[PDB]
Amino acid sequence: SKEIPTPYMWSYQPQMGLAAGASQDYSSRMNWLSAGPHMIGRVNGIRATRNQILLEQAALTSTPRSQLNPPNWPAVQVYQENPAPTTVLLPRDAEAEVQMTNSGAQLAGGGRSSFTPRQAYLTLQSSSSQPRSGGIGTLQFVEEFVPSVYFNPFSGAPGLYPDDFIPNYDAVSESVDGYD
Amino acid sequence: VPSLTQKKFLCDRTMWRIPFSSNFMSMGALTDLGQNMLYANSAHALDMT
């Protein structure tokens, strides 16, 4: 009961990207009620492994932070997207091409051109101007927010409980912004 | 007489099924998206119609 708890699994928010408040795992339980002593000490020996795998997974994978389910993620702790700088091939450098038309030759069609020998091409940055904050994606929620195994559950002062397990709770208001 | 077509189908004795795998192909008891790290650590309500 208190010692081998069925772990609190989270729920994903697709819109905000935050954690949608966790819930007790109620869809993987064995029905050990029809079992004598040689198996109900084996079933409890199984849950005591997934409550130890989930603690040796929470250290390898999750970011060490204070506020689990934070409302506003920082910039550096969110996966960014930095592709290669987009190498743009400029076709015809017009520093000597506008002289060709002013000589009288109208151009058409379209090295790269025969009248000019040179061909410059520029590169430019392909990332965003500012990195992204406020909300993690789906694969970040695959990575972080492993099911939190909560031992000796709800055993303390008010406010000392995990208040974000309530799937209605604002993390920076100490309150449900309810119907108003 | 001029005439417009009207075609339906008829199926009985069986029911539609939509498998949970990615390419909708049955490659085992468990599926591809089933034993994903997603849906086995996290919870997801669905809102069908």
Side-chain angles (χ1 to χ4, degrees):
Chain A
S1 295
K2 291 182 173 65
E3 189 68 31
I4 309 299
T6 313
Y8 282 97
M9 287 187 176
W10 293 95
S11 297
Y12 179 65
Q13 186 66 43
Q15 291 86 5
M16 294 182 287
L18 302 179
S23 301
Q24 193 72 34
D25 191 7
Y26 65 103
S27 290
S28 297
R29 294 193 186 97
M30 299 178 184
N31 204 165
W32 59 272
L33 188 65
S34 300
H38 290 286
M39 295 179 72
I40 64 176
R42 179 68 181 272
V43 171
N44 290 318
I46 295 160
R47 295 174 183 175
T49 61
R50 64 175 290 169
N51 299 130
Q52 288 183 356
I53 291 170
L54 268 59
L55 294 178
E56 74 179 4
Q57 184 176 359
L60 290 173
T61 306
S62 178
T63 299
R65 67 189 185 274
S66 180
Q67 295 178 356
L68 74 165
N69 191 7
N72 191 359
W73 288 87
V76 176
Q77 295 179 357
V78 177
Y79 283 170
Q80 293 301 115
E81 297 86 7
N82 48 2
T86 303
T87 299
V88 179
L89 182 63
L90 297 177
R92 291 173 184 86
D93 190 73
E95 295 177 355
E97 184 267 331
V98 70
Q99 186 67 42
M100 188 66 204
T101 303
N102 289 318
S103 179
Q106 62 179 357
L107 301 182
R112 179 69 180 87
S113 295
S114 66
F115 61 94
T116 176
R118 70 265 188 97
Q119 180 183 3
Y121 64 95
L122 59 90
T123 61
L124 58 92
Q125 185 177 1
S126 63
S127 66
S128 67
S129 296
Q130 298 294 320
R132 188 174 62 84
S133 297
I136 65 171
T138 302
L139 192 273
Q140 193 74 38
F141 193 82
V142 174
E143 181 177 359
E144 296 175 355
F145 291 101
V146 293
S148 296
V149 177
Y150 182 53
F151 289 101
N152 196 1
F154 289 152
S155 296
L160 186 56
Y161 304 110
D163 289 332
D164 54 347
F165 279 166
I166 315 164
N168 292 315
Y169 175 73
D170 286 328
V172 286
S173 181
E174 204 182 3
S175 179
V176 172
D177 282 336
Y179 295 101
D180 199 2
Chain B
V1 59
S3 63
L4 62 93
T5 184
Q6 182 180 2
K7 62 183 184 292
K8 71 187 288 186
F9 64 97
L10 187 144
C11 181
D12 55 352
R13 190 180 293 278
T14 188
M15 62 196 300
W16 299 110
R17 67 180 67 252
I18 303 165
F20 186 66
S21 179
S22 66
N23 56 358
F24 297 102
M25 193 175 291
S26 297
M27 289 176 286
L30 295 175
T31 60
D32 298 328
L33 294 174
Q35 61 181 356
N36 210 172
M37 188 66 212
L38 189 62
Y39 301 102
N41 60 359
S42 65
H44 294 281
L46 75 158
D47 293 331
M48 292 182 189
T49 185

